[PDB]
Amino acid sequence: KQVRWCAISDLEQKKCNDLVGSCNVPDITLVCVLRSSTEDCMTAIKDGQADAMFLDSGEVYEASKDPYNLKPIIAEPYSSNRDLQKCLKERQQALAKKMIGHYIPQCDEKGNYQPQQCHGSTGHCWCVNAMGEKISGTNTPPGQTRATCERHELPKCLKERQVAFVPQCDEKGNYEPQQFHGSTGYSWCVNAIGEEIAGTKTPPGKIPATCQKHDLVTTCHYAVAMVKKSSAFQFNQLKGKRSCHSGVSKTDGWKALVTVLVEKKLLSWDGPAKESIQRAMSKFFSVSCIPGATQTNLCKQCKGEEGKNCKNSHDEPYYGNYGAFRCLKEDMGDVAFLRSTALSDEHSEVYELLCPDNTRKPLNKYKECNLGTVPAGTVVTRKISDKTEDINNFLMEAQKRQCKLFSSAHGKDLMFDDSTLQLALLSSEVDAFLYLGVKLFHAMKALTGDAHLPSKNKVRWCTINKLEKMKCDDWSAVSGGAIACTEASCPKGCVKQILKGEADAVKLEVQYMYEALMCGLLPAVEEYHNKDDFGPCKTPGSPATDFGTLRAVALVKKSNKDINWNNIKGKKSCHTGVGDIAGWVIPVSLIRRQNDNSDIDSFFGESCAPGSDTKSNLCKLCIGDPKNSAANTKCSLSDKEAYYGNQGAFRCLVEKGDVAFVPHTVVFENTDGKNPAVWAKNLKSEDFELLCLDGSRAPVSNYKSCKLSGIPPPAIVTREESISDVVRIVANQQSLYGRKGFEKDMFQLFSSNKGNNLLFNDNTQCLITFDRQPKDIMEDYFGKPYYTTVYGASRSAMSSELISACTIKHCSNSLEVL
């Protein structure tokens, strides 16, 4: 009902009151809370006095910590080569605007961009490629011969796949990060456009380099040092000069400059624990104006009045990008560190850029002469996110109603960056780490001083609940300083902690492994489930045969001698539940591969897959709690469904179905005497058979040959630098607390009184070292069958916030490179 915005200056407050008066959003009211600086507004948000503000990307990490504890919620989205159906999305977005006579993108039937676009209000038309980018020079006014627009829709990857070294592309025509030559057998990592990255080409037999996924984005902004052409100094002579900065906490005015000076060895500075950054900067520069600084000489050149001087606010006339430009223009400084947004063509006559390679270049060369890319700022609110919905509603409705959010006659960059075109909602999972990305997050963490000192003799194991925390505390109190414990809410959180330098290793099931292998983590050891062959456990060197791996199989009755694999379409099937690997992932993936129609909801007849739509075909013949007529628990994801799990899928197969998709272990578990005594009382394993991929059938005990696919074992993952330590520490702890260790009388790693299946599955025998084979790490862990079947041998089969945080953003002028 009410959204309070925190303004850091009087100009921001004037713009805020203007927006309060003019912008009318129904059911939401804008309130302007005035503070004197950015830190004061962050504190007011932390105290509940305000609801949201805009922060530079260099202020997000320090905002996610005490004494602020804020999180980004809304940010400006970038255009990339991963945008799917951009035309439909942008057309809906334009139609949702309360305005007449604006450009609504025209799309065809399939949802692609029409090669010719037209602004119906003005009559202008132009040509456009697959991503909606205007072909240069094709803008024609009304009454003039139009430019004949052809079809620029073929990605470079498939164009190089023709006329033929044959590269691998994903299902959307983008370059796969890893490239494998067929004739010579080499492996190398490539750019977002297919350019080979240096230092990655590895001959065969050698383990290939871990390739990182790349995305190509447009409209990038940079941090630049701007000088007057009348000056004569270079970059390595900045010491003793007078500088102007946009702000002490901004990337484009501080962080990037400090990083460059530390790299180029210009800044005599020990470290964050030994000396403050501001003190080294005060010793480096002469008099300067750096808003927010706490050293006197760093505020000497500022022009604010008493009480307003050197404050992180527009009350200081030298604050921000344009503030630093004004500080340089009035000869209060010799160089100005700001963003590429403040650059204009009216300045190229008097001003130029100061490149870190000790040369000077014009302004229009900022893409080749900068201190680094600067991500966009964010709207931040409290980490508890009590007002995120109202803030998002107000901002989206203000964008729909064309309110003057990103411009003002009072000044530049008030409230938001004036370069901002559109604000979109970020996923609630996004924090400072998931927003900045792994590399930038760790850079900010090292700059602030929170860089963890790695220990080569202690492993920080991550837990996912309190029972695992208690088991880990036992293991740590008995480990003798070799094991410590961190707490997370889910295995995804454990992977995030490992990527943040806060944890060291964690056991992941196969479903969590893809992302883990996509972010650079490697498997250190693997669980060994073979309850028979001991030897690869007691004397490390005995070659392992069967890892106890579960084999996904399609079980049918020997009564029904018509169900083959080449006709499964239409029959009633049984699944263990939506999400299970052998009970859903393998069969659905295989079906979507084989039959190109790709519609599982209509593929089968009345299958029972617990967790699907109650009204769809995938939730029939599911007897949900027969005794409980006081609730409808049909097709439930829990034990309240009689056909849930392996036992439930076998029940469905025995009672009403024709085929079931289960691991091979269910049959022997629910037949041959060892079975329960309610339904499986006189059932024999010879009364069933397995469907094979060749349309044939086999006895149940042939699960190693007549299998849908194999399931990889759960893998303990860690960073690459910690593999050598984690593996041997696991071996040392296993020689003491394993199934056949020295001191099992104190702690067993594979069982606990605190609970079952904590840290490791109780049925596990031991933890074998992962032998990294010289091929794709994805294909090495998953195995080529699982890789190709489920993820299509591609690194684009899935997408999430973590993978986006682990992707490199390859800046570009446009996506026109195709």
Side-chain angles (χ1 to χ4, degrees), residues 176-180 185-190 196-214 517-518 520-522 720 772-778 795:
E176 289 288 346
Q178 184 143 26
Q179 290 298 323
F180 184 12
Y186 272 56
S187 297
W188 59 97
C189 307
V190 288
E196 184 206 63
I197 289 186
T200 68
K201 42 214 302 178
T202 51
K206 164 157 183 171
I207 291 172
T210 57
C211 302
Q212 197 166 12
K213 182 173 168 293
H214 284 70
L517 296 187
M518 198 67 252
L521 295 190
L522 266 53
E720 170 180 333
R772 181 66 209 278
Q773 306 279 53
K775 42 180 162 60
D776 196 330
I777 176 62
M778 229 78 57
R795 298 184 181 182

mmCIF file of all heavy atoms in Angstrom, residues 176-180 185-190 196-214 517-518 520-522 720 772-778 795:
data_model
loop_
_atom_site.group_PDB
_atom_site.id
_atom_site.type_symbol
_atom_site.label_atom_id
_atom_site.label_comp_id
_atom_site.label_asym_id
_atom_site.label_seq_id
_atom_site.Cartn_x
_atom_site.Cartn_y
_atom_site.Cartn_z
ATOM 1 N N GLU A 176 29.569 -24.416 -28.020
ATOM 2 C CA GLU A 176 29.836 -25.109 -26.772
ATOM 3 C C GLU A 176 31.187 -24.659 -26.221
ATOM 4 O O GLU A 176 32.133 -24.461 -26.990
ATOM 5 C CB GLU A 176 29.827 -26.624 -26.975
ATOM 6 C CG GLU A 176 28.450 -27.216 -27.231
ATOM 7 C CD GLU A 176 27.571 -27.222 -25.993
ATOM 8 O OE1 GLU A 176 28.096 -27.012 -24.880
ATOM 9 O OE2 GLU A 176 26.350 -27.440 -26.136
ATOM 10 N N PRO A 177 31.308 -24.479 -24.904
ATOM 11 C CA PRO A 177 32.571 -23.958 -24.353
ATOM 12 C C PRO A 177 33.771 -24.843 -24.635
ATOM 13 O O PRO A 177 34.882 -24.325 -24.812
ATOM 14 C CB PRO A 177 32.282 -23.862 -22.848
ATOM 15 C CG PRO A 177 30.790 -23.798 -22.747
ATOM 16 C CD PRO A 177 30.278 -24.650 -23.865
ATOM 17 N N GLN A 178 33.587 -26.158 -24.688
ATOM 18 C CA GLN A 178 34.673 -27.091 -24.949
ATOM 19 C C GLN A 178 34.574 -27.603 -26.380
ATOM 20 O O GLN A 178 33.488 -27.972 -26.837
ATOM 21 C CB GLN A 178 34.638 -28.257 -23.961
ATOM 22 C CG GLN A 178 35.790 -29.230 -24.116
ATOM 23 C CD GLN A 178 36.282 -29.763 -22.787
ATOM 24 O OE1 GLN A 178 35.534 -29.817 -21.810
ATOM 25 N NE2 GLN A 178 37.549 -30.151 -22.739
ATOM 26 N N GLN A 179 35.705 -27.625 -27.081
ATOM 27 C CA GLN A 179 35.768 -28.050 -28.470
ATOM 28 C C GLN A 179 36.730 -29.220 -28.604
ATOM 29 O O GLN A 179 37.834 -29.201 -28.043
ATOM 30 C CB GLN A 179 36.205 -26.901 -29.382
ATOM 31 C CG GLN A 179 35.155 -25.815 -29.533
ATOM 32 C CD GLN A 179 33.882 -26.325 -30.177
ATOM 33 O OE1 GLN A 179 33.922 -27.161 -31.079
ATOM 34 N NE2 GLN A 179 32.742 -25.829 -29.711
ATOM 35 N N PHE A 180 36.296 -30.223 -29.365
ATOM 36 C CA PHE A 180 36.980 -31.501 -29.511
ATOM 37 C C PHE A 180 37.187 -31.758 -30.996
ATOM 38 O O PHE A 180 36.216 -31.902 -31.744
ATOM 39 C CB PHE A 180 36.152 -32.621 -28.864
ATOM 40 C CG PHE A 180 36.808 -33.981 -28.876
ATOM 41 C CD1 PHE A 180 38.143 -34.142 -29.212
ATOM 42 C CD2 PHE A 180 36.070 -35.105 -28.542
ATOM 43 C CE1 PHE A 180 38.725 -35.398 -29.219
ATOM 44 C CE2 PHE A 180 36.644 -36.361 -28.544
ATOM 45 C CZ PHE A 180 37.973 -36.508 -28.884
ATOM 46 N N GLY A 185 42.281 -35.109 -32.367
ATOM 47 C CA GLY A 185 41.994 -35.464 -30.986
ATOM 48 C C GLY A 185 42.426 -34.442 -29.956
ATOM 49 O O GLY A 185 42.869 -34.820 -28.864
ATOM 50 N N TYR A 186 42.306 -33.158 -30.271
ATOM 51 C CA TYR A 186 42.653 -32.084 -29.351
ATOM 52 C C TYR A 186 41.400 -31.524 -28.688
ATOM 53 O O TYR A 186 40.283 -31.674 -29.186
ATOM 54 C CB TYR A 186 43.403 -30.967 -30.080
ATOM 55 C CG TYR A 186 44.901 -31.166 -30.147
ATOM 56 C CD1 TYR A 186 45.446 -32.319 -30.696
ATOM 57 C CD2 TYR A 186 45.770 -30.192 -29.673
ATOM 58 C CE1 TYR A 186 46.815 -32.501 -30.762
ATOM 59 C CE2 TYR A 186 47.138 -30.365 -29.735
ATOM 60 C CZ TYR A 186 47.656 -31.521 -30.280
ATOM 61 O OH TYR A 186 49.019 -31.695 -30.344
ATOM 62 N N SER A 187 41.604 -30.867 -27.547
ATOM 63 C CA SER A 187 40.530 -30.228 -26.801
ATOM 64 C C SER A 187 40.953 -28.817 -26.424
ATOM 65 O O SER A 187 42.098 -28.593 -26.020
ATOM 66 C CB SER A 187 40.171 -31.022 -25.537
ATOM 67 O OG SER A 187 39.689 -32.313 -25.864
ATOM 68 N N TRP A 188 40.031 -27.867 -26.563
ATOM 69 C CA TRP A 188 40.359 -26.488 -26.219
ATOM 70 C C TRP A 188 39.093 -25.717 -25.870
ATOM 71 O O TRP A 188 37.988 -26.074 -26.279
ATOM 72 C CB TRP A 188 41.116 -25.789 -27.354
ATOM 73 C CG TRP A 188 40.376 -25.751 -28.655
ATOM 74 C CD1 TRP A 188 39.623 -24.721 -29.139
ATOM 75 C CD2 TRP A 188 40.322 -26.786 -29.642
ATOM 76 N NE1 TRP A 188 39.102 -25.051 -30.367
ATOM 77 C CE2 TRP A 188 39.516 -26.315 -30.698
ATOM 78 C CE3 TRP A 188 40.875 -28.066 -29.735
ATOM 79 C CZ2 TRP A 188 39.252 -27.078 -31.831
ATOM 80 C CZ3 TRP A 188 40.611 -28.822 -30.861
ATOM 81 C CH2 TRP A 188 39.806 -28.326 -31.893
ATOM 82 N N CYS A 189 39.277 -24.643 -25.105
ATOM 83 C CA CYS A 189 38.175 -23.773 -24.718
ATOM 84 C C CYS A 189 38.069 -22.607 -25.691
ATOM 85 O O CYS A 189 39.082 -22.087 -26.170
ATOM 86 C CB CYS A 189 38.368 -23.255 -23.293
ATOM 87 S SG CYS A 189 38.662 -24.555 -22.076
ATOM 88 N N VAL A 190 36.836 -22.196 -25.979
ATOM 89 C CA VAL A 190 36.578 -21.180 -26.990
ATOM 90 C C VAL A 190 35.798 -20.025 -26.377
ATOM 91 O O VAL A 190 35.197 -20.136 -25.305
ATOM 92 C CB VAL A 190 35.825 -21.752 -28.208
ATOM 93 C CG1 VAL A 190 36.745 -22.644 -29.023
ATOM 94 C CG2 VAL A 190 34.592 -22.517 -27.755
ATOM 95 N N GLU A 196 39.323 -19.241 -30.179
ATOM 96 C CA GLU A 196 40.043 -20.100 -29.250
ATOM 97 C C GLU A 196 40.698 -19.266 -28.156
ATOM 98 O O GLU A 196 41.384 -18.279 -28.437
ATOM 99 C CB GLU A 196 41.100 -20.913 -29.995
ATOM 100 C CG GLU A 196 41.840 -21.915 -29.125
ATOM 101 C CD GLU A 196 43.224 -22.235 -29.656
ATOM 102 O OE1 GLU A 196 44.066 -21.314 -29.713
ATOM 103 O OE2 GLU A 196 43.467 -23.404 -30.023
ATOM 104 N N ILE A 197 40.482 -19.664 -26.906
ATOM 105 C CA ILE A 197 41.123 -19.007 -25.773
ATOM 106 C C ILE A 197 42.543 -19.541 -25.633
ATOM 107 O O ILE A 197 42.774 -20.755 -25.703
ATOM 108 C CB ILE A 197 40.309 -19.222 -24.486
ATOM 109 C CG1 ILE A 197 39.005 -18.422 -24.545
ATOM 110 C CG2 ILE A 197 41.121 -18.833 -23.259
ATOM 111 C CD1 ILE A 197 38.202 -18.465 -23.263
ATOM 112 N N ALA A 198 43.498 -18.634 -25.444
ATOM 113 C CA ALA A 198 44.900 -19.017 -25.374
ATOM 114 C C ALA A 198 45.179 -19.860 -24.134
ATOM 115 O O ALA A 198 44.566 -19.682 -23.078
ATOM 116 C CB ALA A 198 45.790 -17.775 -25.369
ATOM 117 N N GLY A 199 46.120 -20.792 -24.277
ATOM 118 C CA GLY A 199 46.547 -21.608 -23.159
ATOM 119 C C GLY A 199 45.595 -22.710 -22.756
ATOM 120 O O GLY A 199 45.656 -23.175 -21.614
ATOM 121 N N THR A 200 44.713 -23.146 -23.657
ATOM 122 C CA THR A 200 43.770 -24.215 -23.359
ATOM 123 C C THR A 200 43.902 -25.423 -24.275
ATOM 124 O O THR A 200 43.309 -26.465 -23.977
ATOM 125 C CB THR A 200 42.324 -23.698 -23.435
ATOM 126 O OG1 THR A 200 41.997 -23.382 -24.795
ATOM 127 C CG2 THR A 200 42.153 -22.453 -22.578
ATOM 128 N N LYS A 201 44.651 -25.317 -25.371
ATOM 129 C CA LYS A 201 44.792 -26.420 -26.315
ATOM 130 C C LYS A 201 45.662 -27.512 -25.701
ATOM 131 O O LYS A 201 46.852 -27.302 -25.445
ATOM 132 C CB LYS A 201 45.378 -25.909 -27.627
ATOM 133 C CG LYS A 201 46.515 -24.911 -27.456
ATOM 134 C CD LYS A 201 46.507 -23.860 -28.556
ATOM 135 C CE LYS A 201 46.624 -24.490 -29.933
ATOM 136 N NZ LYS A 201 46.574 -23.464 -31.013
ATOM 137 N N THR A 202 45.069 -28.679 -25.459
ATOM 138 C CA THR A 202 45.758 -29.794 -24.837
ATOM 139 C C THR A 202 45.803 -30.983 -25.788
ATOM 140 O O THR A 202 44.762 -31.368 -26.341
ATOM 141 C CB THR A 202 45.069 -30.204 -23.522
ATOM 142 O OG1 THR A 202 43.668 -30.399 -23.753
ATOM 143 C CG2 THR A 202 45.262 -29.133 -22.459
ATOM 144 N N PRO A 203 46.971 -31.579 -26.010
ATOM 145 C CA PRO A 203 47.059 -32.769 -26.867
ATOM 146 C C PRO A 203 46.292 -33.933 -26.265
ATOM 147 O O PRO A 203 45.945 -33.907 -25.074
ATOM 148 C CB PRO A 203 48.570 -33.056 -26.910
ATOM 149 C CG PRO A 203 49.214 -31.747 -26.590
ATOM 150 C CD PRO A 203 48.298 -31.092 -25.600
ATOM 151 N N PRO A 204 46.003 -34.972 -27.050
ATOM 152 C CA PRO A 204 45.248 -36.110 -26.516
ATOM 153 C C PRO A 204 46.029 -36.852 -25.443
ATOM 154 O O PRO A 204 47.253 -36.754 -25.336
ATOM 155 C CB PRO A 204 45.018 -36.996 -27.746
ATOM 156 C CG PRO A 204 46.116 -36.625 -28.682
ATOM 157 C CD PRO A 204 46.332 -35.156 -28.475
ATOM 158 N N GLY A 205 45.288 -37.606 -24.635
ATOM 159 C CA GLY A 205 45.877 -38.318 -23.518
ATOM 160 C C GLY A 205 46.019 -37.443 -22.290
ATOM 161 O O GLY A 205 46.011 -37.938 -21.159
ATOM 162 N N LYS A 206 46.153 -36.137 -22.504
ATOM 163 C CA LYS A 206 46.248 -35.176 -21.417
ATOM 164 C C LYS A 206 44.858 -34.715 -20.999
ATOM 165 O O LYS A 206 43.974 -34.525 -21.842
ATOM 166 C CB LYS A 206 47.102 -33.975 -21.830
ATOM 167 C CG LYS A 206 46.942 -32.762 -20.926
ATOM 168 C CD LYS A 206 48.141 -31.835 -20.991
ATOM 169 C CE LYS A 206 47.976 -30.679 -20.017
ATOM 170 N NZ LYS A 206 49.219 -29.873 -19.883
ATOM 171 N N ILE A 207 44.670 -34.553 -19.693
ATOM 172 C CA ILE A 207 43.394 -34.059 -19.165
ATOM 173 C C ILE A 207 43.108 -32.682 -19.752
ATOM 174 O O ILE A 207 43.979 -31.791 -19.695
ATOM 175 C CB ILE A 207 43.433 -34.006 -17.629
ATOM 176 C CG1 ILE A 207 43.467 -35.423 -17.052
ATOM 177 C CG2 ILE A 207 42.249 -33.221 -17.086
ATOM 178 C CD1 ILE A 207 43.690 -35.468 -15.560
ATOM 179 N N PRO A 208 41.931 -32.449 -20.325
ATOM 180 C CA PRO A 208 41.662 -31.151 -20.949
ATOM 181 C C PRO A 208 41.420 -30.073 -19.902
ATOM 182 O O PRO A 208 41.096 -30.344 -18.744
ATOM 183 C CB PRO A 208 40.401 -31.403 -21.786
ATOM 184 C CG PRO A 208 40.151 -32.896 -21.722
ATOM 185 C CD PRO A 208 40.793 -33.370 -20.462
ATOM 186 N N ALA A 209 41.586 -28.827 -20.334
ATOM 187 C CA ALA A 209 41.331 -27.696 -19.456
ATOM 188 C C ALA A 209 39.838 -27.554 -19.196
ATOM 189 O O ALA A 209 39.010 -27.790 -20.082
ATOM 190 C CB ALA A 209 41.884 -26.408 -20.066
ATOM 191 N N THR A 210 39.492 -27.172 -17.970
ATOM 192 C CA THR A 210 38.096 -26.952 -17.606
ATOM 193 C C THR A 210 37.606 -25.665 -18.258
ATOM 194 O O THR A 210 38.066 -24.571 -17.912
ATOM 195 C CB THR A 210 37.946 -26.890 -16.089
ATOM 196 O OG1 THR A 210 38.800 -25.866 -15.563
ATOM 197 C CG2 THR A 210 38.317 -28.226 -15.462
ATOM 198 N N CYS A 211 36.677 -25.791 -19.201
ATOM 199 C CA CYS A 211 36.180 -24.645 -19.948
ATOM 200 C C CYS A 211 35.001 -24.006 -19.228
ATOM 201 O O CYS A 211 34.136 -24.699 -18.684
ATOM 202 C CB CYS A 211 35.767 -25.059 -21.361
ATOM 203 S SG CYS A 211 37.095 -25.825 -22.313
ATOM 204 N N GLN A 212 34.973 -22.678 -19.232
ATOM 205 C CA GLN A 212 33.930 -21.911 -18.569
ATOM 206 C C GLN A 212 32.932 -21.397 -19.599
ATOM 207 O O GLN A 212 33.316 -20.946 -20.682
ATOM 208 C CB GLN A 212 34.534 -20.745 -17.784
ATOM 209 C CG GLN A 212 33.605 -20.144 -16.744
ATOM 210 C CD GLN A 212 34.334 -19.239 -15.769
ATOM 211 O OE1 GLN A 212 35.491 -18.875 -15.989
ATOM 212 N NE2 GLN A 212 33.664 -18.876 -14.682
ATOM 213 N N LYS A 213 31.649 -21.474 -19.254
ATOM 214 C CA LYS A 213 30.595 -21.060 -20.170
ATOM 215 C C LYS A 213 30.633 -19.551 -20.384
ATOM 216 O O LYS A 213 30.890 -18.781 -19.455
ATOM 217 C CB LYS A 213 29.233 -21.493 -19.626
ATOM 218 C CG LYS A 213 28.048 -21.163 -20.519
ATOM 219 C CD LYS A 213 26.772 -21.781 -19.968
ATOM 220 C CE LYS A 213 25.539 -21.241 -20.672
ATOM 221 N NZ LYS A 213 25.327 -19.796 -20.381
ATOM 222 N N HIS A 214 30.378 -19.130 -21.621
ATOM 223 C CA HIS A 214 30.450 -17.730 -22.013
ATOM 224 C C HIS A 214 29.108 -17.252 -22.549
ATOM 225 O O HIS A 214 28.416 -17.984 -23.264
ATOM 226 C CB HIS A 214 31.529 -17.505 -23.079
ATOM 227 C CG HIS A 214 32.926 -17.523 -22.541
ATOM 228 N ND1 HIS A 214 33.535 -18.672 -22.085
ATOM 229 C CD2 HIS A 214 33.834 -16.530 -22.391
ATOM 230 C CE1 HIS A 214 34.758 -18.386 -21.676
ATOM 231 N NE2 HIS A 214 34.964 -17.094 -21.851
ATOM 232 N N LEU A 517 29.312 -29.269 -11.758
ATOM 233 C CA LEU A 517 30.332 -29.388 -12.790
ATOM 234 C C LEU A 517 30.317 -28.206 -13.748
ATOM 235 O O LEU A 517 31.325 -27.956 -14.418
ATOM 236 C CB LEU A 517 30.154 -30.694 -13.568
ATOM 237 C CG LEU A 517 30.333 -31.993 -12.782
ATOM 238 C CD1 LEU A 517 30.302 -33.190 -13.720
ATOM 239 C CD2 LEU A 517 31.625 -31.968 -11.984
ATOM 240 N N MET A 518 29.204 -27.473 -13.819
ATOM 241 C CA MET A 518 29.126 -26.300 -14.677
ATOM 242 C C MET A 518 29.817 -25.090 -14.066
ATOM 243 O O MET A 518 30.235 -24.193 -14.806
ATOM 244 C CB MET A 518 27.661 -25.968 -14.972
ATOM 245 C CG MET A 518 27.444 -25.065 -16.178
ATOM 246 S SD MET A 518 27.898 -25.849 -17.738
ATOM 247 C CE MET A 518 29.393 -24.952 -18.153
ATOM 248 N N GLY A 520 32.636 -25.273 -12.222
ATOM 249 C CA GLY A 520 34.052 -25.524 -12.064
ATOM 250 C C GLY A 520 34.429 -26.483 -10.955
ATOM 251 O O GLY A 520 35.614 -26.816 -10.831
ATOM 252 N N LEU A 521 33.474 -26.934 -10.147
ATOM 253 C CA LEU A 521 33.793 -27.882 -9.089
ATOM 254 C C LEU A 521 34.083 -29.260 -9.672
ATOM 255 O O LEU A 521 33.508 -29.668 -10.685
ATOM 256 C CB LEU A 521 32.652 -27.969 -8.077
ATOM 257 C CG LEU A 521 32.367 -26.698 -7.276
ATOM 258 C CD1 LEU A 521 31.398 -26.986 -6.139
ATOM 259 C CD2 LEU A 521 33.659 -26.094 -6.748
ATOM 260 N N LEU A 522 34.992 -29.978 -9.017
ATOM 261 C CA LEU A 522 35.425 -31.296 -9.449
ATOM 262 C C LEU A 522 35.126 -32.331 -8.370
ATOM 263 O O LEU A 522 35.142 -32.010 -7.177
ATOM 264 C CB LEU A 522 36.928 -31.306 -9.765
ATOM 265 C CG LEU A 522 37.354 -31.080 -11.219
ATOM 266 C CD1 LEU A 522 36.740 -29.814 -11.796
ATOM 267 C CD2 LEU A 522 38.871 -31.031 -11.322
ATOM 268 N N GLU A 720 39.129 -27.042 -7.337
ATOM 269 C CA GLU A 720 40.259 -27.702 -7.985
ATOM 270 C C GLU A 720 41.517 -27.615 -7.129
ATOM 271 O O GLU A 720 42.259 -28.597 -7.005
ATOM 272 C CB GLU A 720 40.505 -27.089 -9.363
ATOM 273 C CG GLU A 720 41.803 -27.537 -10.018
ATOM 274 C CD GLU A 720 42.012 -26.917 -11.384
ATOM 275 O OE1 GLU A 720 41.009 -26.569 -12.042
ATOM 276 O OE2 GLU A 720 43.182 -26.774 -11.799
ATOM 277 N N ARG A 772 40.501 -38.883 -12.473
ATOM 278 C CA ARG A 772 40.131 -37.962 -13.543
ATOM 279 C C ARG A 772 40.677 -38.476 -14.870
ATOM 280 O O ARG A 772 41.890 -38.467 -15.099
ATOM 281 C CB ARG A 772 40.658 -36.563 -13.239
ATOM 282 C CG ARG A 772 40.303 -35.530 -14.293
ATOM 283 C CD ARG A 772 38.806 -35.273 -14.339
ATOM 284 N NE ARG A 772 38.369 -34.864 -15.667
ATOM 285 C CZ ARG A 772 38.464 -33.631 -16.144
ATOM 286 N NH1 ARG A 772 38.982 -32.649 -15.424
ATOM 287 N NH2 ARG A 772 38.033 -33.377 -17.376
ATOM 288 N N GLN A 773 39.780 -38.923 -15.749
ATOM 289 C CA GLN A 773 40.159 -39.424 -17.060
ATOM 290 C C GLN A 773 40.343 -38.267 -18.043
ATOM 291 O O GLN A 773 39.693 -37.226 -17.917
ATOM 292 C CB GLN A 773 39.098 -40.384 -17.588
ATOM 293 C CG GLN A 773 38.763 -41.538 -16.651
ATOM 294 C CD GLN A 773 39.758 -42.683 -16.736
ATOM 295 O OE1 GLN A 773 40.966 -42.485 -16.612
ATOM 296 N NE2 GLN A 773 39.249 -43.890 -16.955
ATOM 297 N N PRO A 774 41.229 -38.424 -19.035
ATOM 298 C CA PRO A 774 41.487 -37.330 -20.000
ATOM 299 C C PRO A 774 40.378 -37.152 -21.033
ATOM 300 O O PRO A 774 40.494 -37.512 -22.204
ATOM 301 C CB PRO A 774 42.801 -37.764 -20.652
ATOM 302 C CG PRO A 774 42.782 -39.254 -20.572
ATOM 303 C CD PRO A 774 42.110 -39.585 -19.266
ATOM 304 N N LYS A 775 39.271 -36.571 -20.584
ATOM 305 C CA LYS A 775 38.151 -36.231 -21.452
ATOM 306 C C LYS A 775 37.324 -35.155 -20.757
ATOM 307 O O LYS A 775 37.761 -34.555 -19.768
ATOM 308 C CB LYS A 775 37.323 -37.472 -21.800
ATOM 309 C CG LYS A 775 37.068 -38.419 -20.636
ATOM 310 C CD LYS A 775 36.233 -39.610 -21.086
ATOM 311 C CE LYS A 775 36.321 -40.764 -20.100
ATOM 312 N NZ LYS A 775 35.836 -40.394 -18.743
ATOM 313 N N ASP A 776 36.128 -34.903 -21.282
ATOM 314 C CA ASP A 776 35.244 -33.908 -20.691
ATOM 315 C C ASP A 776 34.858 -34.328 -19.279
ATOM 316 O O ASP A 776 34.453 -35.471 -19.047
ATOM 317 C CB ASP A 776 33.994 -33.733 -21.559
ATOM 318 C CG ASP A 776 33.222 -32.462 -21.235
ATOM 319 O OD1 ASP A 776 33.253 -32.009 -20.071
ATOM 320 O OD2 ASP A 776 32.574 -31.913 -22.151
ATOM 321 N N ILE A 777 34.997 -33.396 -18.331
ATOM 322 C CA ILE A 777 34.660 -33.692 -16.941
ATOM 323 C C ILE A 777 33.189 -34.072 -16.820
ATOM 324 O O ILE A 777 32.820 -34.946 -16.024
ATOM 325 C CB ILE A 777 35.025 -32.497 -16.037
ATOM 326 C CG1 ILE A 777 34.586 -32.753 -14.593
ATOM 327 C CG2 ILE A 777 34.425 -31.205 -16.575
ATOM 328 C CD1 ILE A 777 35.265 -33.943 -13.951
ATOM 329 N N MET A 778 32.328 -33.434 -17.617
ATOM 330 C CA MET A 778 30.929 -33.841 -17.682
ATOM 331 C C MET A 778 30.810 -35.290 -18.137
ATOM 332 O O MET A 778 30.171 -36.115 -17.474
ATOM 333 C CB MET A 778 30.162 -32.917 -18.629
ATOM 334 C CG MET A 778 28.866 -32.366 -18.063
ATOM 335 S SD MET A 778 29.138 -30.999 -16.922
ATOM 336 C CE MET A 778 30.041 -29.859 -17.968
ATOM 337 N N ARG A 795 26.414 -28.141 -22.639
ATOM 338 C CA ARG A 795 26.506 -27.305 -21.451
ATOM 339 C C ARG A 795 25.472 -26.185 -21.459
ATOM 340 O O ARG A 795 25.643 -25.180 -20.760
ATOM 341 C CB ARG A 795 27.923 -26.745 -21.311
ATOM 342 C CG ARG A 795 28.968 -27.834 -21.129
ATOM 343 C CD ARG A 795 30.357 -27.276 -20.885
ATOM 344 N NE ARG A 795 31.336 -28.347 -20.737
ATOM 345 C CZ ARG A 795 32.624 -28.160 -20.484
ATOM 346 N NH1 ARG A 795 33.131 -26.946 -20.340
ATOM 347 N NH2 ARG A 795 33.423 -29.217 -20.375
#
